[PDB]
Design a protein around this ligand. Structure first.
Ligand SMILES: Nc1ncnc2c1ncn2[C@@H]1O[C@H](COP(=O)(O)OP(=O)(O)OP(=O)(O)O)[C@@H](O)[C@H]1O
Ligand SMILES: [Mg+2]
Lengths: 71, 51, 384, 52
């Protein structure tokens, strides 16, 4: 009962990635309408992945979590 | 020498039986303390000199 | 003023008391006497080092018990039996020995998150006759609540059962809630206080279980006073309708009948109930023969508010411009919480100018703001 | 007034808080039958229940 080694973050996963060992199955073409909401989901997801710093340079508060609600 | 000998005494620390974080519900003036171990239950047990 | 003399005398004897205690404990609480040295040798022989906690389910009459530990494993324990076999009982927390589990002893005195709610977290700092005025029917609450504790003598002359219980009712502003806490000051009996919106829970069946507790605690103190604040709040309040509803209300009333008296025959609990809705209750508690005298209080009249206002303005710095009797004159049979509110707002106007003297203007302008709350809490204004 | 407030807490702290424990004066010897219950296995029992 002592700390004898440390483990990397990568190892000791709940389950390994599905996005650089598999590829999502549904594309954006299989979505029809909700075009107003499509302008928003590329604001919510896509822009913080390619570069977070666009927001910083404006100085506008980032979006954090994504809530999807609906019936 | 400093480097090689720190390892051997440190073995004692590594080969210790258990630790167990507790919290004092209350003292007793019988020079024991009521301690609730957090994963486990309650034990009334004697103290050391530091405290 | 010149209450100095008191503070000195009390403080001085406390200083000596602290001294005596400290010195008494150290080196002249002799651990060198044979009655202390020989006692601990053979006490520790069976008393631990770690003393595994149990919870006592049941005893067996052979000097044994069956414990269930909070840790897990049950044990069929014996009893060292210098803690007096007939002195412990289910629900107690027990000291077991760490070689083989024997009841070394028994802890007494517990606390729960359910008696945390009851117990007092203050001691009143406003004592009696800060409810002064309306004092002509304070004689049926100082001769059935205070007195049998103060003199059992007078109730020996008549013999039979003493007075138990009072219910206070009237319009609000007759001081009921603090009156309960002020007769408690005098008697020096354990004063529990429980609000009646905590006897309504958003879960079902566990309501009666909370209420059943409250009087068992109280009888354990040989004298207690239990104040239920707003016992009209168990007959108007509900959460959701699938774990509250009529049923939750209904059960708790029935429970409180057994607690007030029923079969139990517990110790002395004086009960104080303040209510003003006295028709949402069982017709088995508001009968005389349980709650003996019922007390009515009426709005304070012209002469009574003269009594009330000298209570509140003694804390104020009065000017010679201040006329107390004209503040009384205008109102017609209205609440004594109003008088308390006008004095608070008078010190707020005095603070608005920044001056810790309270002037006549502040009372006389605050009066009208108070009266605007009666004459536009009903937007009809002058009756139509 | 404030000296009074300070000294009550001091008296309380120095007296100490303790946990009451039951006794028995007609037991001045309890390790005439305490020693038998102690130190070997004669046994305190893991309680069970017959299911079949
Ligand atoms: N008749 C009165 N005389 C003096 N003070 C009063 C009177 N009525 C109420 N008060 C004061 O009002 C404050 C709160 O009153 P309390 O809560 O004790 O009364 P209540 O009658 O139960 O109802 P409410 O709180 O609705 O007025 C306290 O400062 C109390 O001293
Ligand atoms: Mg009220």
């Amino acid at each position: 009962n002592a700390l004898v080694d440390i483990l990397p973050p990568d190892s000791d996963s709940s389950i390994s990635v599905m996005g650089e060992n598999e590829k999502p199955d549904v594309t954006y073409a299989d979505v029809g309408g909700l075009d107003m909401q499509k302008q928003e989901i590329r604001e919510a997801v896509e822009l913080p992945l390619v570069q977070a710093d666009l927001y910083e340079q404006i100085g506008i508060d980032p979006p954090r979590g994504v809530l999807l609600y609906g019936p | 020498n400093d480097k090689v000998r720190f390892i051997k005494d440190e073995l004692r620390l590594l080969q210790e039986p258990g630790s167990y974080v507790g919290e004092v519900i209350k003292i007793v003036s019988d020079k024991k303390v009521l301690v609730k171990v957090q994963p486990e239950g309650k034990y009334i047990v004697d103290v050391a000199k530091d405290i | 003023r010149c209450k100095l003399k008191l503070l000195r005398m009390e403080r001085i004897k406390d200083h000596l008391l602290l001294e005596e205690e400290f010195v008494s404990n150290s080196e002249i609480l002799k651990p060198f006497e044979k009655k202390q040295e020989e006692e601990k040798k053979q006490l520790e022989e069976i008393r631990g080092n770690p003393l595994s906690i149990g919870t006592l389910e049941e005893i067996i009459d052979d000097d044994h018990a069956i414990v269930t530990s909070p840790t897990m494993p049950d044990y069929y324990v014996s009893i060292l039996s210098f803690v007096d076999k007939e002195l412990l009982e289910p629900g107690c927390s027990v000291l077991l020995h760490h070689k083989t589990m024997s009841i070394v002893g028994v802890l007494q005195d517990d606390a729960d998150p359910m008696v945390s709610v009851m117990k007092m977290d203050k001691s009143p700092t406003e004592s009696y006759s800060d409810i002064g005025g309306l004092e002509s029917q304070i004689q049926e609450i100082k001769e059935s609540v205070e007195l049998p504790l103060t003199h059992p003598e007078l109730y020996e002359e008549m013999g039979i059962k003493p007075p138990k219980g009072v219910i206070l009712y009237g319009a609000p502003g007759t001081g009921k809630t603090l009156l309960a806490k002020a007769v408690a000051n005098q008697t020096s009996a354990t004063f529990l206080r429980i609000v009646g919106s905590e006897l309504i829970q958003k879960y079902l069946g566990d309501g009666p279980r909370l209420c059943r507790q409250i009087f068992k605690v109280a009888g354990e103190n040989a004298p207690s006073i239990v104040f239920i604040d707003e016992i009209d709040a168990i007959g108007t309040k509900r959460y959701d309708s699938n774990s509250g509803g009529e049923r939750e209300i209904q059960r708790t009333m029935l429970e409180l009948l057994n607690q007030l008296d029923g079969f139990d025959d517990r110790g002395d609990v004086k009960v104080i109930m303040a209510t003003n809705k006295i028709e949402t209750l069982d017709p088995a508690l508001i009968r005389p023969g349980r709650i003996d005298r019922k007390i009515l209080f009426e709005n304070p009249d012209l002469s009574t508010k003269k009594k009330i206002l000298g209570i509140h303005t003694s804390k104020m710095n009065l000017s010679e411009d201040v006329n107390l009797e004209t503040l009384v004159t205008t109102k017609d049979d209205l609440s004594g919480a109003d008088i308390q509110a006008m004095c608070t707002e008078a010190g707020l106007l005095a603070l608005r100018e920044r001056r810790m003297q309270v002037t006549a203007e502040d009372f006389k302008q605050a009066k009208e703001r108070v009266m605007k709350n009666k004459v536009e809490e009903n937007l009809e204004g002058l009756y139509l | 007034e404030n000296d009074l407030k300070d000294i009550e807490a001091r008296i309380k702290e120095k007296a100490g808080v303790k946990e009451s424990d039951t006794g028995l004066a007609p037991s001045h010897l309890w390790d005439i039958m305490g020693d038998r219950q102690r130190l070997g296995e004669e046994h305190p029992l893991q309680v069970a229940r017959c299911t079949k």
